[PDB]
Amino acid sequence: ITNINCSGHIWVEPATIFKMGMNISIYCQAAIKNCQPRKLHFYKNGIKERFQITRINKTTARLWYKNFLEPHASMYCTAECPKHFQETLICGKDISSGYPPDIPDEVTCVIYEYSGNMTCTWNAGKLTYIDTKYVVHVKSLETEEEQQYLTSSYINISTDSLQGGKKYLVWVQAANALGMEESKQLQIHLDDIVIPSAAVISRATIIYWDSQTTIEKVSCEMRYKATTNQTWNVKEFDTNFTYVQQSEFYLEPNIKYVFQVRCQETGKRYWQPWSSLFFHKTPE
Amino acid sequence: EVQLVESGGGLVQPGGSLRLSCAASGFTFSTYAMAWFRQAPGKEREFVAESWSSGTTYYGASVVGRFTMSRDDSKNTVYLQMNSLRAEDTAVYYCAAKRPDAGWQTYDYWGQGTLVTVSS
Ligand SMILES: *[C@@H]1O[C@H](CO[C@@H]2O[C@@H](C)[C@@H](O)[C@@H](O)[C@@H]2O)[C@@H](O[C@@H]2O[C@H](CO)[C@@H](O)[C@H](O)[C@H]2NC(C)=O)[C@H](O)[C@H]1NC(C)=O
Ligand SMILES: *[C@@H]1O[C@H](CO)[C@@H](O[C@@H]2O[C@H](CO)[C@@H](O)[C@H](O)[C@H]2NC(C)=O)[C@H](O)[C@H]1NC(C)=O
Ligand SMILES: *[C@@H]1O[C@H](CO)[C@@H](O)[C@H](O)[C@H]1NC(C)=O
Ligand SMILES: *[C@@H]1O[C@H](CO)[C@@H](O)[C@H](O)[C@H]1NC(C)=O
């Protein structure tokens, strides 16, 4: 921000940051040496406001907005000083509008194989528009050491900081200028939240796919489907990535198909995201 | 890139006049606010004028009445007519472009500046 010496000042009620849809009052007070202003004007990003403006003091004026819904607006007020045909800038002010944070829910922490990271994400919820922060707390059920991590999206906690036992508590706190919520605590066991290394499809009746996982017990799911059909066909596996995983599929001739696969540590809670779409137009 | 290049700087007498130019390019001119600033030796950068496509134009208290800003959106240029020049106006004059959704006092672009000396 470049500094502009103001010949006055501006102030907003309820405040410069307010809930969307609130009625707001903007006040502007002239303080210009040798100048009892004839009039005072308000501009929103250079557009003159011509209504709901009220002369109060001989020096103060008020602009009033109803159900103010814009997330951002820069405001300028100027004075018509006598002895001049031009307007002296009094001051400007930035106002902004949003909502207070919803309670973060759907908190989930997982560890992708070979990452060294625990990835905690959550549903922040309703868009807040304004600047909100997130503090992820981590508590060891063994030692009760608490760590806090600041983020504006999600968080990767390095596994080297999770060596105080395996049972942990994680909650996510959200805060902006309009409110501050906190999530229900999630208890995790580091061994229960692991997702096997990604699985990938490579070559197209026979489909070649493989993963670098080293998890002892891995279960998988491959689903196929004619591009134009809408019901998936899931073929459940219990695979073993010793050698490459090839999967044979019957299918009609000159038709285009789609395949995806996903795997998990047999029995664990989470899976991994489905693969990207592997297309295949077979011959006639 | 974008570019703001000023012109019209030079020497002038106390009481004289002159006019600065500023050619603008790269960004959408109509939607940006254009501003003149100045910076005397040692003294700090100060506001002198600003003008919008809508026509809204306001001035710093120090130069209102004596100075007059205008802008040709076709020619993508702003001007600053400086009259009744006093020695106080001896300073380098800067052209500035302000984006609307930015702050009310954050200018993303600045010209190199033209020096204006008011002798005596
Ligand atoms: C925004 O204000 C309106 C009306 O405000 C009135 O006029 C202003 C200039 C100021 O003097 C206020 O004190 C006045 O109240 C509100 O309209 C009312 O809405 C309520 C419920 O929302 C309803 O019961 C009333 O009948 C409405 N009429 C009046 C005259 O109050 C409006 O609600 C306000 N909006 C918000 C989001 O607070
Ligand atoms: C593990 O997590 C860390 C932290 O999230 C990742 O390192 C960050 O990587 C980004 C680039 O995506 C950088 O901008 C950050 O500065 C890095 N932070 C730190 C602290 O190094 C890292 O990539 C992750 N490792 C994985 C997933 O293997
Ligand atoms: C009106 O003038 C007085 C005198 O300085 C000032 O204190 C006050 O803030 C002004 N306006 C309001 C709404 O109080
Ligand atoms: C967190 O880790 C994931 C994979 O575990 C990685 O893709 C992502 O970039 C990381 N997050 C960051 C760097 O913010």
Residue among A234, A242, A281 at smallest CA distance from A261: A234
- In whole angstroms, what is the distance from residue A107 CA to residue A187 CA? 10
**Where do we find the tokens 């254009």?**
B34
Is A200 exposed, middle or buried (CB count within 10 Å of its CB: 0-12, 13-18, 19+)? middle
Decide: A60 in ligand 3 pocket, CB within 6 A.
yes
Superfamily of domain B3-102: Immunoglobulins (2.60.40.10)
Amino acid at B78: V
Q: Which residues of A touch B104 (CB under 8 A)?
A: 74-76, 92-94
Superfamily of domain A8-98: Immunoglobulins (2.60.40.10)
Domain boundaries, chain B: 3-102
- In whole angstroms, what is the distance from residue A11 CA to residue A9 CA? 7
Contact flag A46-B58 (C-beta cutoff 8 Å): no
Q: What does residue A153 show for φ and ψ, rounded to 5 degrees?
A: -125, -105
Structure determined by: X-ray
Amino acid at A211: S
Decide: A57 in ligand 3 pocket, CB within 6 A.
yes
Contact flag A93-B104 (C-beta cutoff 8 Å): yes
Documented resolution in Å: 2.8
Determine the distance in angstroms separating the CA of B117 from the nearest CA of chain A, rounded to an integer.
23
DSSP string, chain B: --EEEEE--EEE-TT--EEEEEEEESS-GGGSEEEEEEE-SSSPPEEEEEE-TT--EEE-TTTTTTEEEEEETTTTEEEEEE-S--GGG-EEEEEEEE-TTS-TT-EEEE---EEEEE--
Q: Which residues, in sequence order, are bridge partners of residue A108?
A: A121
Class of domain A196-281: mainly beta
**Close Cβ partners of A265 (under 8 Å, ≥ 6 residues apart):** A194, A195, A196, A215, A217, A218, A219
Residue by residue, what is the 3-state secondary structure of chain A?
CCCCCCCEEEEEECCCEEECCCCEEEEEEECCCCCCCCEEEEEECCEEECCCEEECCCCEEEEEECCCCCCEEEEEEEEECCCCCCEEEEEEEEEEEECCCCCCEEEEEEEECCCCEEEEEEECCCCCCCCCEEEEEEEECCCCCEEEEEECCCEEEEHHHCCCCCEEEEEEEEEECCEEEECCCEEEEHHHCEECCCEEEEECCEEEEEECCCCCCEEEEEEEEECCCCCCEEEECCCCCCCCEEEECCCCCCCEEEEEEEEEECCCCCCCCCCCCEEEECCC
Contact flag B50-A89 (C-beta cutoff 8 Å): yes
Q: Contact at 8 Å (CB) between A234 and A221?
A: yes
Q: Which residues of B touch A5 (CB under 8 A)?
A: 46-47, 60
Give the atom of ligand 2 at the shortest distance from the alpha carbon of A114: 28
Residues of chain A with CATH 2.60.40.10: 8-98, 105-192, 196-281
Decide: A153 in ligand 1 pocket, CB within 6 A.
no
- In whole angstroms, what is the distance from residue A61 CA to residue A53 CA? 7
Determine the distance in angstroms separating the CA of B33 from the nearest CA of chain A, rounded to an integer.
8
CA distances from A170 to A113, A161, A182, A184, A195 (A): 20, 14, 11, 9, 19
Class of domain A105-192: mainly beta
**Where do we find the tokens 């490579």?**
A202
Could you say which ligand is closest to the alpha carbon of residue A13? 3
- In whole angstroms, what is the distance from residue B47 CA to residue A127 CA? 37
